[PDB]
């Protein structure tokens, strides 16, 4: 159809920026005990 060439870019980001935020603070946590 006739979608907003960037609607996808916004969804993709908005699902990484916020999401990654957690795959960041989480990981640093398990390493609170010299682990991956």
């Amino acid at each position: 159809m006739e979608v907003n060439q960037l609607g996808f870019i916004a969804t993709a980001l908005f699902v990484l920026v916020p999401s990654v935020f957690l795959i960041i603070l989480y990981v640093q946590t398990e390493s609170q005990q010299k682990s991956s």
Partner: peptide, 30 residues
């Protein structure tokens, strides 16, 4: 696209499910 996105955001709700039903950090009784 538009559909490719829809099937993706979805297939991760499926991963996110698998992950919290088997990668549940056991609840500790202390």
């Amino acid at each position: 696209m538009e559909t490719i996105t829809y099937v993706f955001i979805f297939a991760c709700i499926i991963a996110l499910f698998f992950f919290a039903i088997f990668f549940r950090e056991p609840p500790r009784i202390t």
